[PDB]
Amino acid sequence: SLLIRGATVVTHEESYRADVLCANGLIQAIGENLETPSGCDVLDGGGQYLMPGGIDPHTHMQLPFMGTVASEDFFSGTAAGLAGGTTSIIDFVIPNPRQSLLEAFHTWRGWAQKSAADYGFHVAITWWSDEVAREMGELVAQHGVNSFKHFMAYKNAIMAADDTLVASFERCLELGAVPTVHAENGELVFHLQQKLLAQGLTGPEAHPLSRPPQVEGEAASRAIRIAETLGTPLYLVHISSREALDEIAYARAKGQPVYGEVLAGHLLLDDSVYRHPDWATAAGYVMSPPFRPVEHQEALWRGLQSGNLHTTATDHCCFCAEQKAMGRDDFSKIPNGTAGIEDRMALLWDAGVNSGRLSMHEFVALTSTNTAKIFNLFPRKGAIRVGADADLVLWDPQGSRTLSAATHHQRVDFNIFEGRTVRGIPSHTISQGKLLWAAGDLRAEPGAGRYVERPAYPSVYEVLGRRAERQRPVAVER
Amino acid sequence: SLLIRGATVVTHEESYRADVLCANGLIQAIGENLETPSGCDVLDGGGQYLMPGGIDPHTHMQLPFMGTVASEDFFSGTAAGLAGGTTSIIDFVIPNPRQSLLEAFHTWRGWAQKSAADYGFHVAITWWSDEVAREMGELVAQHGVNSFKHFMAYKNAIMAADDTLVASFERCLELGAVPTVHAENGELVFHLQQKLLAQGLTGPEAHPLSRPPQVEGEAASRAIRIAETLGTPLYLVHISSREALDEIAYARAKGQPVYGEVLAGHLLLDDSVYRHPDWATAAGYVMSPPFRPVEHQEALWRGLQSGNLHTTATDHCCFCAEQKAMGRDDFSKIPNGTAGIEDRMALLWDAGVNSGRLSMHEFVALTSTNTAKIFNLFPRKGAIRVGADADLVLWDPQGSRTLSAATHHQRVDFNIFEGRTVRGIPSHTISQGKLLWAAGDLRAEPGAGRYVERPAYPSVYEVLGRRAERQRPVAVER
Ligand SMILES: Nc1c[nH]c(=O)[nH]c1=O
Ligand SMILES: [Zn+2]
Ligand SMILES: [Zn+2]
Ligand SMILES: [Zn+2]
Ligand SMILES: [Zn+2]
């Protein structure tokens, strides 16, 4: 048993002073001046905020990708996420083309067994056949998967063309699963990569030039309108561009269920990072989509404030300087990805709440509750109520931290926010009711985390259902 | 020679009283009370408006298509255009996949020699290879073509996927040619067509359901964004939807050279036409894009008024009842297309000018001058000025005409505006300085029209070149 006493509870919609009791991995009681069970550890949260633990729905722990394997494994990644107040992740099963999905799924369950905190998976659809359609049904019915990932970029690899997107989205509808998309036009990226290389522009500064923001806006428009035509919801991962955000807003203004996810990097960094004089420094920012001219950061913030972006994530995909250097002579070969699982919540609090573009309640909604709702984990997760998983974070608004690769718990030799000082840190992280991060001490244990099943048919599917019934076609009688 | 006396000259920007003298196919003199050369014919235009003859940039005379050949041929179609005030067309060479473009071009020249008025061609890119790219250059350099058409629908036929779109648009940029696009997502069309057929919805009412508006908005988005990425202008044919119009307005607002074309059918008809209890009547409206719910008509009129739609055309593609009946058990086999070359100008005048939606100057811009400027034919066409081609229409603002398949000159048994009465009609049409339509008397002759060459590099390409030079990628030395 673990009792957090004297703090202010901050949810996605309200604040109030109360104590919180956890036991057996669940939240047992909430209230002022709670009784203390015998032999129950006590945590003093005076002057701090008690919030749901962060959920990161976009991580790539130890992903084999672009000629190599990510430097962060499932244990060091989930542990680092605990240090930064994040208590569960959704990662990605990425089968190779013509490789079986259940095969990939069990393989990934294997790798993820070492997780120190709760974890789940999105399954990517990297090819199509009647068997993928059948396997998708199995993953939802028997293995707790309720979301499928589609890559519109990475031509001559994992890219899903329109024919796949249509088939798979239609399958998700049948299964009550949520289609999710990496929205970049693969044909234009491939075309621009070759053209820049043929011009001899091989540095990291060519990476943004190879996939400018309209390449994302285009794919977002296409994913969104396939989803509209087939009558499914749609979740777009790491939106970086005004173009893509405007497409989401346009569809939502048409009341379509479209969600957008954003990373701290795309809220706070611009594309000048790729022109850094030092190659390894610039290479460190190479991910897709890339960082953008400053006007896109401001559009994304307004996306958060307006309700047109819905979740924060990290695309946590680490590669050390030596792996980055795999493309020292060809930006197209630099393994794509940045780290951020540990830094997401502090970064957003410091830039959003301290500044105050975001209220404390929006901070919560954007770091856990919205993700939980979208993927049908609410109120089990991202919620402070009796019966919910005891995933919590205690937040010192006056604590300070300076992000550096030399001191962060993420196993990677680079931090895209190196040297940045944030006011507002997680003093204590609580996962499954146990205190796994405390005032500098990390208590993560390999294998401590559970695999989290997400049930199919989130509530959006009931409204979609009624809509589809109103729109059934009537033949003309002749 | 031919002198038009006493009319009000109306251009794309102004109105003034003057006579106009034509001779040798050209406009010779403009001024009040011009002297009459001896032997010159005189036309009294008192109380009427003298405007440039209409240019219809979207016709398909005797096109072989969807199993058959359009009922209108190049003589009957251009003659019918003349009765309606339209003095020149741009048609489409549509090579079959793997067919040489040059081969198809010469064949089409044979088909079009019988035209009664000036004509030109757009050439469609229905497949890709190095030969295609070479033949595009030859068509521009030797054959007066400066625009290339791309079909984004017609899966498993003339459809261009992104790889062809990108390669062709790049070729277009190299040649100073205008890419034009039929913007519908073919994968979604094909998927919806089979779905609806599988459910037994075989009638014409399924045609609009098989290609809802967002299918067009998606393809407009994608064509527009490819164009932006490659640095070309872009011309989208027959825009029917708010979604597509919004994509054009959005790219035009970012400063991008995007032009939109609209048919009178999509300005004035709604999709209730496909539910007519008579099969032949409903089939008569079947074209792609289909006619839309009424809110899209309002949006289109608004595009015209705001400057986000730029040209009018007809997609003149005629099929009689027995030909339409090829799809009596399968709407996907109904040959797509409607008639309008003869009716476009009166329809737009009556609905746009009489209502005050459009000024008379906007009417001229939208029926001739904007098309001329976009395809590099201004001021040879669409302009009343000494030396311009003598293509003129004399317009009686209080004349009246009732549109009817029983009385029109279009060689087709269906009119999508059957029984509509319009106020403001062409009393006389002058082509190559000759009076070919004189209040009810059509004097069109087979073979009188000239093939019209269009020079490459319209003016927009000078601006694009200056932008490209400013945005040249620049490496970082390390
Ligand atoms: N060529 C065409 C004629 N008519 C149509 O409706 N669509 C076409 O693509
Ligand atoms: Zn991604
Ligand atoms: Zn990712
Ligand atoms: Zn068309
Ligand atoms: Zn057409």
Short mmCIF file of N, CA, C and O in Angstrom, two decimals, chain B residues 7 35 62 82 115 126 174 215 221 244 254 259 285 295 372 387 436:
data_model
loop_
_atom_site.label_atom_id
_atom_site.label_comp_id
_atom_site.label_asym_id
_atom_site.label_seq_id
_atom_site.Cartn_x
_atom_site.Cartn_y
_atom_site.Cartn_z
N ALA B 7 -22.36 48.54 -81.85
CA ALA B 7 -22.48 47.74 -80.65
C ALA B 7 -21.70 48.37 -79.49
O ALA B 7 -20.91 49.31 -79.66
N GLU B 35 -15.02 54.15 -90.95
CA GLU B 35 -15.40 54.15 -92.35
C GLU B 35 -15.49 52.72 -92.88
O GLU B 35 -14.81 51.81 -92.39
N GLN B 62 -16.02 13.23 -80.75
CA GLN B 62 -15.90 11.83 -81.17
C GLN B 62 -14.83 11.06 -80.41
O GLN B 62 -14.07 10.28 -81.00
N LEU B 82 -20.35 27.22 -82.31
CA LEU B 82 -20.52 28.51 -82.97
C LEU B 82 -21.94 29.05 -82.78
O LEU B 82 -22.13 30.24 -82.49
N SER B 115 -13.16 20.12 -88.34
CA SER B 115 -13.69 21.17 -87.47
C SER B 115 -14.08 22.40 -88.27
O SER B 115 -13.40 22.79 -89.24
N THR B 126 -1.19 9.06 -70.21
CA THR B 126 -1.90 7.88 -69.74
C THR B 126 -0.97 6.72 -69.38
O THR B 126 -1.46 5.63 -69.07
N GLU B 174 10.19 21.24 -67.37
CA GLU B 174 11.33 21.33 -68.27
C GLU B 174 10.95 21.94 -69.61
O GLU B 174 11.74 22.68 -70.20
N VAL B 215 -13.61 12.64 -52.50
CA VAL B 215 -12.75 11.91 -53.42
C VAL B 215 -12.09 12.89 -54.38
O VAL B 215 -10.96 12.67 -54.83
N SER B 221 -6.09 18.19 -53.65
CA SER B 221 -5.00 18.34 -52.68
C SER B 221 -3.69 17.75 -53.21
O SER B 221 -2.64 18.40 -53.15
N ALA B 244 -12.75 20.54 -53.22
CA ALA B 244 -11.74 20.86 -54.23
C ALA B 244 -11.52 22.37 -54.31
O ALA B 244 -10.38 22.85 -54.28
N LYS B 254 -1.39 30.70 -50.54
CA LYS B 254 -0.01 30.50 -50.17
C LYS B 254 0.79 31.09 -51.30
O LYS B 254 1.98 30.99 -51.33
N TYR B 259 -5.08 27.08 -61.07
CA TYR B 259 -6.25 27.54 -61.80
C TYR B 259 -7.34 26.49 -61.72
O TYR B 259 -7.06 25.30 -61.71
N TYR B 285 -27.40 12.32 -67.09
CA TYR B 285 -26.60 13.21 -66.26
C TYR B 285 -25.30 12.57 -65.80
O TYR B 285 -24.51 13.24 -65.13
N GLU B 295 -25.31 22.65 -51.89
CA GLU B 295 -24.36 23.54 -51.24
C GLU B 295 -23.06 23.67 -52.03
O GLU B 295 -22.33 24.64 -51.84
N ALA B 372 -7.49 31.97 -72.39
CA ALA B 372 -6.45 32.41 -73.31
C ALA B 372 -5.15 32.70 -72.56
O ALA B 372 -4.06 32.31 -73.00
N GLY B 387 -5.25 43.30 -84.63
CA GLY B 387 -4.32 42.20 -84.79
C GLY B 387 -4.73 40.91 -84.10
O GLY B 387 -4.20 39.85 -84.46
N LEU B 436 -20.54 33.16 -89.05
CA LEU B 436 -20.92 31.75 -89.16
C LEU B 436 -22.21 31.43 -88.42
O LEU B 436 -22.73 30.32 -88.58
#
